[PDB]
């Protein structure tokens, strides 16, 4: 149904170790499709999914040039950020950017994004209106003033409503075998005695795509949030993801617990129990 495209920039200064490293990765949903790294032997935008390989040489030259220009732009941004925060040239600092668009089943824009962070803290963000900015502090307010003067938001809006959604629609069609296939979780509950009267029940979800999933334990039909150990969803390395949720239960009470699984590849949410 719904889909997203996102580009992520990371620009990291490293005084004494050359110019700041600039990396760009692009995703459609939870699928990496392009990368650029300024430390690469001959830096270029490179394909990372089969369906982007059919874009012609002109695409790759244009995309590479955008990245080459942005490595310079973001190196300048790093220097500017030092001034704005009255910082020494001694330390390593990081600017990040994430921008892109979400589209619905009909491929219309649901919303656009363009936001930056400095040293892991929000710096500036294009508002959902795609016409105004939210600056995090008085430093970012200087940037806001410059972007207001140069009508950057209008230019971002044109991109988000145009090329962003248009290119994503093309990617979704070219990659329809994978990007438009949801792989449901393979689920099971394992049982591990901790001590005489304590047992760990672990609910597994494996082999699923996209990454979004909900795993919850209930005891007598009531959610056990504060008693549930929930690991972060993690990549398998084969495009798919894994997750588990665990509860510690009194021996003999295993059947009072039920694991609940929600995923877009499942027609209805699943209920699992430990199966002796």
């Amino acid at each position: 149904g719904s889909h997203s495209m996102r580009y992520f920039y990371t620009a990291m200064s490293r005084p004494g170790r050359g110019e700041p490293r600039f990396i760009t990765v692009g995703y459609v949903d939870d699928t990496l499709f392009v990368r650029f790294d300024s430390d690469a032997t001959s830096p270029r935008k490179e394909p990372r999914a089969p369906w982007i390989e059919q874009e012609g040489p002109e695409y790759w030259d244009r995309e590479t040039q955008i990245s080459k220009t942005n490595t310079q732009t973001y190196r300048e941004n790093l220097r500017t950020a030092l001034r704005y925060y009255n910082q020494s040239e001694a330390g390593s600092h990081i600017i990040q950017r994430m921008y892109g668009c979400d589209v619905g089943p009909d491929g219309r824009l649901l919303r656009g994004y363009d936001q930056d962070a400095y040293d892991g803290k929000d710096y500036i963000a294009l508002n959902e209106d795609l016409s105004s900015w939210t600056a995090a502090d008085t430093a970012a307010q200087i940037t806001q003033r410059k972007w207001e003067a140069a009508r950057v938001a209008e230019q971002d809006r044109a991109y988000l409503e145009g090329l962003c959604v248009e290119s994503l629609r093309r990617y979704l069609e070219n990659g329809k075998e994978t990007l438009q296939r949801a792989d449901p979780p393979k689920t099971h509950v394992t049982h591990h005695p901790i001590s005489d009267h304590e047992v760990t029940l672990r609910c597994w979800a494996l082999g699923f795509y996209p990454a979004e999933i909900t795993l919850t334990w209930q005891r007598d039909g009531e959610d056990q949030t504060q008693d549930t150990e929930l690991v972060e969803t993690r990549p398998a390395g084969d495009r798919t993801f894994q997750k588990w949720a665990a509860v510690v239960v009194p021996s003999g009470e295993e059947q009072r617990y039920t694991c609940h699984v929600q995923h877009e590849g499942l027609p209805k949410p699943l209920t699992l129990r430990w199966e002796p």
């Binding site: 760009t24 244009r62 995309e63 410059k146």
Partner: peptide, 10 residues
């Protein structure tokens, strides 16, 4: 495809 808006500076 990326936004090719060039001259945006902090």
């Amino acid at each position: 495809e990326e936004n090719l808006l060039d001259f945006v500076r902090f």
